[PDB]
Nucleic acid binder design. Structure first.
Lengths: 82, 186, 149, 129, 30
RNA sequence: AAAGUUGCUGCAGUUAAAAAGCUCGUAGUUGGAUCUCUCUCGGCCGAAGCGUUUACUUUGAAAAAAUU
């Protein structure tokens, strides 16, 4: 109590904090590579996308926008990028 | 190969000119180095008798030099003895307009031509294999500043041994003490 | 806190410290600019352009990859509307509430919200006329509202 | 709204040190804040501080010591001619030994003693004892 | 309880005693 | 003058004098961070454009005695 190094917070408190209240702010969102199960193409999709993103070749529904993160279609595979 | 703004080639500059000529005539980096050119060079002693070469290159071709950075550095490390190779954009400092100046400032100087913008760009260009993901400035009790730069951890093995010559060249070129760290988690 | 709502939220966007373009993005600045051009030809506002570019094309920030923000890109080739998108949206909202008032006369809440929207319109028009985006003779009239849409 | 960030920084420092804290985080940073804290630092009042650089107006983490009783801003920045210093200190500093009026003068940011020594006046920023 | 003016006198006197306290602690350092 | 009962220094406004039903709403007041001297003619110098203009600060001159 009354004694904590504010310059060097351990990563669980920095991850726990609100994104604007971090020591240097950083977004909680990310970009992800998705593959449609009906094809082999790779698509770069924002995690918190607000618009429905269609396949360039299959024209299938990849992600559905929700209140927070997008809802990927059951069957599509994804991998977090960087 | 060399086009100095003062148009006065030194023998360091001619030596690295024939060095880049040897790399252009032999290695696979033929199609792009012929298009490019540099401006100047200097040799600085840092870290207790360990030399380093610095190459001043004109600005609008750095991105081309950002494509061929690491290969050219490793080939000049094979070419020379144990040294370090860094590239610096030739950045121009426009003086601060005071109430005693010459009448050449009929327009406002650009914000990119200021002192601080040039020095943060220079600190960015010292480190291409890494990227500056953080920066802090410690103001010690004596009143002298000390910049600490946090670089990237995912590639940390590449430039771990090069941080000392980074601090040395930045101190020589600016007069500011800097240190470099690597955070455990982003 | 907000201008007229007494509530004070925090939700916004937090730009990362990394201004550099990430390595995985193989799109160049030019291809981004013609993406902006087709998107503007589709009748899209700059906000919608940035949203679609972020959601689908992987462009984190147009200003980080192209060096300019989207309105200047649309202004260079003249694919920019005469009046800005926020003023346009306030004006559309005013027309919608006014038409609802013409159908419904007992909605005093819609009258109060119309006063609020028109107050926003006046303040932002004052700001734009200060920075010469609007001509000095421009004025919002209640009857001169559906013609701007 | 948030005007006079130096006032908010000094209020935060005072409030944190009266609660017996060891460090204080102040945001946003400013060059006037940094010069004011340097003026405190050279007199041994606030230890040593560090500027955290995000691409916005930065933050400062200050290592508090305990020798400070109150630091304060004088708003608005009144014109202080070189005579008025005695008057101003007899209004502000509770004694003749310790306490500091900080002035922004044409020679930079300084305290009232160094203001007298360089023979200049300026505008008043704050005081700390 | 007790008058305000006496409390104000006491607070002023304890703050004055702290003022010479800090001055004497600073003088001992030289 | 005590007197901080006119308060700039330096007052007050739950319950004692006293804060407006609520929101919008001119002017005025107040406003985040950021930017490190030279050209001509005359004997290293003198004239000239100043350098955006200020506000601010300092210096120098000039400024009845009496009173203090």
């Amino acid at each position: 109590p009354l004694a904590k190094d504010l310059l060097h917070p351990s990563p669980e408190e920095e991850k726990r904090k609100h994104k604007k209240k971090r020591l240097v702010q950083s977004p909680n969102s990310y970009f992800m590579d998705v593959k449609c199960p009906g094809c082999y193409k790779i698509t770069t999709v924002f995690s918190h996308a607000q618009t429905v993103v269609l396949c360039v070749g299959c024209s299938t529904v990849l992600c559905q926008p929700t209140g927070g993160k997008a809802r990927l279609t059951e069957g599509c595979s994804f991998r977090r990028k960087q | 190969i060399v086009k100095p703004n003062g148009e006065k080639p030194d023998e360091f500059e001619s030596g690295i000119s024939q060095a880049l000529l040897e790399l252009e005539m032999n290695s696979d980096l033929k199609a792009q180095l012929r298009e490019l050119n540099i401006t100047a060079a200097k040799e600085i002693e840092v870290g207790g008798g360990r030399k380093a070469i610095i190459i001043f290159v004109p600005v609008p071709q750095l991105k081309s030099f950002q494509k061929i950075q690491v290969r050219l550095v490793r080939e000049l490390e094979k070419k020379f003895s144990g040294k370090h190779v860094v590239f610096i954009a030739q950045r121009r400092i426009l003086p601060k307009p005071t109430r005693k100046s010459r009448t050449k400032n009929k327009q406002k100087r650009p914000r990119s031509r200021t002192l601080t913008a040039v020095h943060d760009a220079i600190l960015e260009d010292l480190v291409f294999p890494s990227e500056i993901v953080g920066k802090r400035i410690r103001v010690k009790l004596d009143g002298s500043r000390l910049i600490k730069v946090h670089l990237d951890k995912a590639q940390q093995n590449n430039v771990e041994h090069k941080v000392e010559t980074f601090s040395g060249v930045y101190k020589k070129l600016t007069g500011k003490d800097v240190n470099f760290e690597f955070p455990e988690f982003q | 806190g907000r201008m007229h709502a007494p509530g004070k939220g925090l939700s916004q966007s937090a730009l990362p410290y990394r201004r550099s373009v990430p390595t995985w993005l193989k799109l160049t600045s030019d291809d981004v600019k013609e993406q902006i051009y087709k998107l503007a030809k589709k009748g899209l506002t700059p906000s919608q352009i940035g949203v679609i570019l972020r959601d689908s094309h992987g462009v984190a920030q147009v200003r980080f990859v192209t060096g300019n923000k989207i309105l200047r890109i649309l202004k260079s080739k003249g694919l920019a509307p005469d009046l800005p998108e926020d003023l346009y949206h306030l004006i559309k909202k005013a027309v919608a509430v006014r038409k609802h008032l013409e159908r419904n006369r007992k909605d005093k809440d819609a009258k109060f919200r119309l006063i609020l929207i028109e107050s926003r319109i006046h303040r932002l028009a004052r700001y734009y006329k200060t920075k010469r985006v609007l001509p000095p003779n421009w004025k919002y009239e209640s009857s001169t509202a559906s013609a701007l849409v | 709204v948030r005007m006079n960030v130096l006032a908010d920084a000094l209020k935060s420092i005072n409030n944190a040190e009266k609660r017996g804290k060891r460090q204080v985080l102040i945001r946003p940073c400013s060059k006037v804040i940094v010069r004011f804290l340097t003026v405190m630092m050279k007199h041994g009042y606030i230890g040593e501080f560090e500027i955290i650089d995000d691409h916005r107006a930065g933050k400062i983490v200050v290592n508090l010591t305990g020798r400070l009783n109150k630091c304060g801003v004088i708003s608005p920045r009144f014109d202080v001619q070189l005579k008025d210093l005695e008057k101003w200190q007899n209004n502000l500093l509770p004694s003749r030994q310790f306490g500091f009026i900080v002035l922004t003068t044409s020679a930079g940011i300084m305290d009232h003693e160094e203001a007298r020594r360089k023979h200049t006046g300026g505008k008043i920023l704050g005081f700390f004892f | 309880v007790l008058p305000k003016k006496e409390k104000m006198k006491l607070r002023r006197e304890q703050w004055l005693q702290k003022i010479e306290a800090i001055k004497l602690a600073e003088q001992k350092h030289r």
